[PDB]
């Protein structure tokens, strides 16, 4: 008789079905712009965010989700009837949140808690959350859900292109960003999430048009051996996203092609004009 709660954070891109789940708890990630604190969905929209960021004197800054809030929810979970909790948070490679909460797994009597490192964010992370609920609805036990998540995590990644590397370098998430930035200004680098969940240069490509072709070739090879969802994700780049989506459809790549967007949390770090292809097994 497992009664399961699922946690994630607002860096995940969540479907309408998932957002309505009664056992889902989402931790907000605040964004500070020139000293003013915003939380998307409370006092900020994604459209407003890109206008504020373009106007701001300094780059926005994100903060980790609140460990105090997570504790507040976990402390009430037993009294709500829960026996298990699964936390699917943004990659340990892009935020210190994951490491800072590891103490919690044995801190709540009567609750079995697991925090797998997802090594991702955005739409693949939201698909992991949705998958957990679908597997639970299919009758999987806790250990089986953990195993299926591990399979997804092992075969999930994303390939990214940005208009301005300043957000990734000054925000600190591009591996070695400050040391390598000088050599990236004359080309269009393709970034990716490596096997440690860290954003790093995958390939240097001389033109944006050749980089776009490489994105398609990469996704074709990484998803060729099984059933994958591919997501075209953009931050204020809807024309480029539609072109990339159509290209994947013209060549029959992936078992599922969809669109998503970057809001305040990830747009702070990628900047406007960003595009990514994420992929994750269907299971």
Ligand X SMILES: CCCCCCCCCCCCCCCC(=O)O
**CB 191 to ligand X: min, Å:** 8
| Closer residue to ligand X in complex, CB, 81/96 | 96
| Closer residue to ligand X in complex, CB, 62/152 | 62
**CB 97 to ligand X: min, Å:** 6
CA distances from 274 to 176, 228, 265 (A): 20, 22, 13
**CB 111 to ligand X: min, Å:** 25
Give the list of residues 6+ apart from residue 48 with CB closer than 8 angstroms, or none: none
Residue numbering of the annotated binding site: 62, 95
**DSSP labels for the chain?**
---EEEEEETTB---HHHHT-TTEEEE---EEETTEEE-BTTTB-HHHHHHHHHH-SS--EE-PPPHHHHHHHHHHHTTTT--EEEE--S-TTT-SHHHHTGGGGGSSTT-EEE-------HHHHHHHHHHHHHHHHTT--HHHHHHHHHHHHHT-EEEEE-S-THHHHHTT-BTTHHHHHHHHTTSEEEEEE-TTS-EEEEEEESSHHHHHHHHHHHHHHHTTTS-EEEEEEEES-HHHHHHHHHHHHHTT-SSEEEEEE--HHHHHHH-TTEEEEEEEE--
- List contacts with ligand X (CB under 6 A): 11, 29, 62-64, 94-95, 97, 120-124, 158, 160, 173, 233, 265-266, 269-270, 276, 278
| Closer residue to ligand X in complex, CB, 64/146 | 64
| Closer residue to ligand X in complex, CB, 111/211 | 211
| Closer residue to ligand X in complex, CB, 148/167 | 167
Residue numbering of the annotated binding site for hexadecanoate: 62, 95
């Amino acid at each position: 008789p497992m009664k399961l709660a699922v946690f994630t954070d607002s860096s995940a891109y969540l479907s309408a079905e998932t957002l309505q789940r009664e056992d889902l708890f989402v931790l907000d990630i605040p964004v500070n712009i020139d000293g003013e604190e915003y939380v998307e969905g409370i006092n900020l929209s994604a459209e407003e965010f890109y206008q504020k960021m373009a106007q701001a004197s300094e780059l926005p800054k994100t903060s980790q989700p609140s460990i105090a809030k997570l504790d507040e929810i976990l402390t009430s979970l037993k009294e709500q009837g829960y026996t298990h909790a699964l936390g699917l948070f943004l990659s340990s490679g892009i935020s210190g949140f994951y490491q800072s909460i590891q103490y919690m797994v044995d801190d709540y009597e009567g609750l079995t808690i697991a925090f797998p490192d997802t090594l991702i964010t955005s739409a693949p992370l939201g698909i992991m959350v949705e998958s957990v609920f679908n597997w639970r609805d299919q009758g999987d036990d806790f250990a089986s859900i953990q195993d299926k998540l591990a399979i997804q995590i092992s075969r999930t990644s994303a390939f990214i292109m940005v208009d301005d590397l300043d957000h990734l370098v000054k925000g600190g998430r591009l591996s070695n960003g400050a040391a390598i930035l000088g050599n990236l200004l004359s080309i269009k680098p393709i970034l990716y999430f490596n096997d440690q969940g860290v954003i790093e240069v995958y390939e240097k490509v001389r033109t944006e048009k050749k980089a776009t072709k490489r994105l398609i070739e990469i996704i074709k090879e990484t998803t060729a051996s099984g059933q994958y969802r591919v997501i075209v994700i953009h931050g204020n780049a809807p024309e480029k996203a539609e072109e990339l989506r159509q290209h994947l459809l013209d060549f029959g790549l992936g078992s599922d092609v969809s669109l998503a967007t970057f809001g305040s949390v990830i747009g702070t770090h990628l900047g406007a004009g960003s595009i990514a292809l994420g992929y994750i097994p269907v299971i």
